[PDB]
Each structure stands twice: as structure tokens, then as C-alpha cells.
Design a binder for this molecule. Structure first.
Ligand SMILES: NC(=O)c1ccc[n+]([C@@H]2O[C@H](COP(=O)([O-])OP(=O)(O)OC[C@H]3O[C@@H](n4cnc5c(N)ncnc54)[C@H](OP(=O)(O)O)[C@@H]3O)[C@@H](O)[C@H]2O)c1
Ligand SMILES: NC(=O)c1ccc[n+]([C@@H]2O[C@H](COP(=O)([O-])OP(=O)(O)OC[C@H]3O[C@@H](n4cnc5c(N)ncnc54)[C@H](OP(=O)(O)O)[C@@H]3O)[C@@H](O)[C@H]2O)c1
Ligand SMILES: CCCSc1nc(N2CCN(C)CC2)ccc1C(=O)N[C@@H]1[C@@H]2C[C@@H]3C[C@H]1C[C@@](O)(C3)C2
Ligand SMILES: CCCSc1nc(N2CCN(C)CC2)ccc1C(=O)N[C@@H]1[C@@H]2C[C@@H]3C[C@H]1C[C@@](O)(C3)C2
Ligand SMILES: [Cl-]
Lengths: 266, 258
């Protein structure tokens, strides 16, 4: 169903693109001849990424460096990126504040910083981007976790932030549908991926089979291109099977059948 | 299983207790002879609530008015509620910021405010209350919604905050299980209730199926008294059947049992 040609000449933002899955998504998109604007705080690393993009065959490639603790920077970044590409077809929200596995004691600072960078900035990014995306019938891809669907210890702040994205973005997806905004929203639920940060964070306590970041990046990109609601990716097929929430879908649907302005009408 | 006598002379905080479901939890707890401290912004209204509590037979009843937009008020409130009662056996976190059913557009401020009042304050209140609760082996009750489990239009900010409640609190519940912290956590997933806020906000055409707030309040108390992880309450038993998510239990235990 998917063809890499689908991304040729397309206009794409990737946040969190200095390393990990973000860097990989930038590279896959370059290979397909996209225009790409990448972002992160290290300008020095971003420069290297931007170079291997050009090398790979990107229609173009630029960076803008900054912290997504700064909502003003979030807004300005999207405008600056849009000017650079003359538009925007896809927005890949991927970055997070640095975290590590710990029991939770009192760190309200960390819960709040997590909610700001991981959640609030995804919203501020979306609001800046939407005019451009509405005109191009674009797509928003929101990168998330198993831990944003199910409960695990040692990541409370991080999980609250990721659960937050599901509720916010899944809700506004219903709104776009009834009010005919033809922008797609794709939520990506990943298991352990073999990025360097993840492998460092985990080398103390139960690793299981991390999955490969290269195929992960491409699965995320396939999802967004195909306008799927959700992408799942994990090294175990049991875990894949059990992530779907069929009865949530039934509940959401019974509501929509009963109350959408367009109940009858197809 | 549940007996009213279980709450007799117990030390309980109830937030958002000036109106709706929380007011009703205050009263039910009063009939059972609990010590209760209530909170919210409406000082005149909270006073009348407290009066009715003594009348109904509360061991004691007091209020402390304030806004849960202010994290430092949140902290101080638990310390004060603790001194008044000597301790805390149960923390019922129930309040929310004002919300209407609207399509989302630009209002980052509303998203932030929802996150602070509906979610961050709950976390600040847990931290302040955890020592007392540790030494009483008590219970934390977090009130949430179907819209904290499933996605509906017209409540984006609100759902973010409730989903966030689930992720944070179900995560630390796992932590207390591993580190043998003997405090229970109960997440309540509510359908439409006949509180005056809901009836103002929701159209006439759905009013039919709003559950009674009195029964809703007693169920919340029962769940936490019995240390149940979740409590479901909705006027349709069909919605209740569908709310459970066995797949998530399994994934959680597939990790936990290693
Ligand atoms: N790796 C996994 O096992 C795993 C599992 C589930 C979900 N995920 C999700 O996948 C996404 C990427 O994970 P990853 O392993 O690729 O992460 P990573 O390699 O550690 O990358 C994090 C990226 O975000 C940037 N960043 C950090 N703080 C920032 C800030 N304040 N403002 C703007 N950018 C900031 C970092 O660059 P700078 O420091 O230079 O700013 C970096 O580019 C995350 O959303 C994560 O939740 C990962
Ligand atoms: N009713 C439903 O259909 C329904 C459905 C699902 C879930 N729920 C849940 O039930 C709980 C209460 O619902 P309800 O219908 O009973 O609500 P409600 O009648 O409007 O009561 C909300 C309470 O929260 C307090 N509050 C509002 N802003 C506050 C602030 N800044 N600081 C401190 N307290 C504040 C209000 O008091 P003041 O104005 O005096 O401050 C009031 O006591 C909520 O968690 C809600 O999510 C209700
Ligand atoms: C112990 C919980 C780790 S969080 C986590 N858990 C998963 N489960 C664990 C149990 N297995 C049965 C399935 C994979 C899957 C994904 C996550 C997960 O999202 N892990 C990430 C978190 C925590 C640290 C590692 C990752 C990168 C990060 O920056 C640091 C953010
Ligand atoms: C349109 C969605 C409204 S949010 C909501 N939806 C539910 N669905 C509706 C359809 N039913 C078949 C199943 C339950 C159930 C509960 C909620 C729900 O949580 N409603 C509350 C929200 C929205 C307004 C009413 C409540 C109080 C509030 O302050 C104003 C905040
Ligand atoms: Cl990496």
C-alpha cells in the first residue's frame, strides 16, 4: 500500500531529530527526497544530521535549534520552518525531556517539566502548524509509548505526559472528523527501541529485546503517510496483539453513531 | 463486604466538596460518623456544607477555602487538615476547573489551567499527604471519567488531564506494590451524573441517562474503603461491561511477574 515516492518533495518537520528515532526519521525522509526541517537543542549535532540528509538525497534540509520548554520558541519555530519550505505537509512531534528510571518521591519539578516539554509543547506546535496543514490536507504524527497506554513503575511523570497526549490528540481527532478538518492524526505506541539513551537508561534493570530504531522510524513514517490512527511497534508479537483496545473503539463508536451532527448522511 | 462502620471516626479529606459529587461524599461520610475536612473556593457554601455534616452526625467537620490553581495552597491545606484531625486515613481528590463542551481552537491557557487544577494539584496533594497516609495505611481516591478512558469530542483539555491522572496514579500504584508502601489507590471512572454542573453543560436530549449523585458518592467511598483499584459507575450496565480492559492488565503483569 505504501510507496516511498509518497514522501517525494513533501514538506516535513521532525522534532527531537538530533539523535534516536528522530535522527532516523530525518534520514529515511531524506532518502525519499523530502524537504525536512529538523530541531533539537544541540546546533552542533543538528548540523551533522542536516549534512547526511543532503547527502542521502533530501529535496532540501535545514535546522533550527532551541528548547521546547520555551513555548514562544515552539510557535516561532513552526513559522520559521514553514517559511523555509514554503509550506508544511507533515508534523512529526517526537522530542521529550530527558528522563531516567526512578521511583517517584517528591519531584514536582520533574512532573511539571515533563508535562511542559512532552505534552504542552506538542499542542503549541500543533496550533502553530494547523493553518499550513489545513491548506495541504496534511498530517500530524505524535510519538508515544506502551507506557502511554498501560501502567509501569519507574516512569510516573513520563507516563502521565504520554497518557495526556492520547486523551488530547484522540479527542481533537473526533473533532476534526465532525467539523471536516482534513488533517490526519497518528498516535505511535512503541516498546523499547534500541536508541542510545534508552539503552543507557535501561542497562541497570530488565532489558528485554529492544526493537531496531531504523525499522521503527520507517513504520512511524508509513503510519503518517497512510493516515492510520495508531501505529504499534514492539519486538514481541504478544505485546503487539495486547495493545489494541477493541472495547474502547466500540464505546467511542456507539457515541459517534448516536450524536455526531452527521449521524445519518454519507 | 462494605459496612458503614468502616468509616466511623476515620480522618478524611474531600476536595471539590462545595458542590456536586463531593458535597454528597461529605454528607455520606458525615452520616457514618467520620472526621471530615472539606475544600473548594466558595467559603459561604462550604460553611453550610460543614453545618449539615454536624447535623448528620460527623465526628467533626471543618472547611479550608482556596484555589487549587495555587500549588502552595495545596501543600499548606493538607498540613492544616492533618493538624486539625491528628492524621489522615483517606484522601479524596475530586475537584476540577470549569469546563464547557466546545471545539478546541487556540486556547493554550485553558489546556494549561486544566492540567494544573485537574492534574498537577492532585500530585502536589498526594506528596503532602503521603507521610500521614503511610502511617495510617490509608487510601487515595482519584475521581475521573469515561472521558479519562475513552476519547470524545468537545473535551480535549479535560480528557488530557484525566488520562494524565490514570497514567500517573496507576504508575505509582505499581511503585507502591514493589516498594511495599501500604497505601491504596482507587481511580473512579464515572458516567454522566445528575450534578448541576453537568445538567447546565449538557443539553436536554442527554439528561435522561444521568446517574444519581447520591448513589455515585457512596460508590466512590465504598471502592476506596475496600481498596479496589478502580470503581466504575454509569447508569448503563452496558457501558460498565465495556469499560474494563483485560489486555492492559495482562501487559502490566507480563512485566510485573518477571
Ligand atoms: N527509545 C525508546 O525505547 C522509546 C520507547 C517508547 C517511546 N519512545 C519515544 O520516542 C521518542 C524519541 O525517543 P528517543 O529514544 O529517540 O529519544 P532520544 O534519542 O533521547 O532523543 C531525544 C531528542 O529530543 C531532543 N530534546 C531533548 N530535550 C529537548 C528539549 N528540551 N527541547 C527540544 N528538544 C529536546 C534531544 O536533543 P537535544 O538534547 O540536543 O535537545 C533529542 O534529539 C520519544 O518521544 C519517546 O518518548 C522511545
Ligand atoms: N458530573 C458528571 O457528569 C461527571 C462525569 C464524569 C466525571 N465527573 C467527575 O466528578 C468530579 C466532580 O464533578 P461534579 O459534577 O460534581 O462537579 P461540580 O459539581 O462542578 O463540583 C466541582 C467542585 O470542584 C470545585 N472547584 C472548581 N474550581 C476549583 C478550584 N480552582 N480550586 C478548588 N476547587 C475548585 C468546585 O468548587 P468551587 O467553585 O467552590 O471552587 C466544586 O466544589 C470531577 O472530578 C469530575 O471530573 C463528573
Ligand atoms: C520499566 C518501565 C520502562 S518504560 C517502558 N517500558 C516498556 N515495556 C517494559 C516492560 N516490557 C514487558 C515491555 C516494554 C516499553 C517502553 C517503555 C519506554 O517508553 N521507555 C522509555 C522511557 C524510560 C527510559 C527508557 C525509554 C526511553 C526514555 O527516554 C528513558 C523514556
Ligand atoms: C460529549 C462528551 C462529554 S464528556 C463525557 N461524556 C460521557 N459519555 C457521553 C455519552 N454516553 C453514551 C457515555 C458517556 C460521559 C461523561 C463525560 C464527562 O466527563 N462529562 C463532564 C465534563 C463535560 C461536562 C459534563 C461533565 C461535567 C463537566 O464539568 C461538564 C466536565
Ligand atoms: Cl541512538
Amino acid at each position: 500500500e505504501f510507496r516511498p515516492e509518497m514522501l517525494q518533495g513533501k514538506k516535513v518537520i521532525v522534532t527531537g531529530a538530533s539523535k534516536g528515532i528522530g535522527r532516523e526519521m530525518a534520514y529515511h525522509l531524506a532518502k525519499m527526497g523530502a524537504h525536512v526541517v529538523v530541531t533539537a537543542r544541540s546546533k552542533e549535532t543538528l548540523q551533522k544530521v542536516v549534512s547526511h540528509c543532503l547527502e542521502l538525497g533530501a529535496a532540501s534540509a535545514h535546522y533550527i535549534a532551541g528548547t521546547m520548554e520555551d513555548m514562544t520558541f515552539a510557535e516561532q519555530f513552526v513559522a520559521q520552518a514553514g517559511k523555509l519550505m514554503g509550506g508544511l505537509d507533515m508534523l512529526i512531534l517526537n522530542h521529550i525531556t530527558n528522563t531516567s528510571l526512578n521511583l517517584f518521591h517528591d519531584d514536582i519539578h520533574h512532573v511539571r517539566k515533563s508535562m511542559e516539554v512532552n505534552f504542552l509543547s506538542y499542542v503549541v506546535l500543533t496550533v502553530a502548524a494547523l493553518p499550513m496543514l489545513k491548506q495541504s490536507n496534511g498530517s500530524i504524527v505524535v510519538v508515544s509509548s506502551l507506557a502511554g497506554k498501560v501502567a509501569y513503575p519507574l516512569v510516573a511523570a513520563y507516563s502521565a505526559s504520554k497518557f495526556a497526549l492520547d486523551g488530547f490528540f484522540s479527542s481533537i481527532r473526533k473533532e476534526y472528523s465532525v467539523s471536516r478538518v482534513n488533517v490526519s492524526i497518528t498516535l505511535c505506541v512503541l516498546g523499547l527501541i534500541d536508541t542510545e539513551t534508552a539503552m543507557k537508561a535501561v542497562s541497570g534493570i530488565v532489558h528485554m529485546q529492544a526493537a531496531p530504531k531504523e525499522e521503527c522510524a520507517l513504520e512511524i513514517i508509513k503510519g503518517g503517510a497512510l493516515r492510520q490512527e495508531e501505529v504499534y511497534y514492539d519486538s514481541s508479537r504478544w505485546t503487539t496483539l495486547l495493545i489494541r483496545n477493541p472495547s474502547r473503539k466500540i464505546l467511542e463508536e456507539l457515541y459517534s453513531t448516536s450524536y455526531n451532527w452527521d449521524r445519518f448522511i454519507n
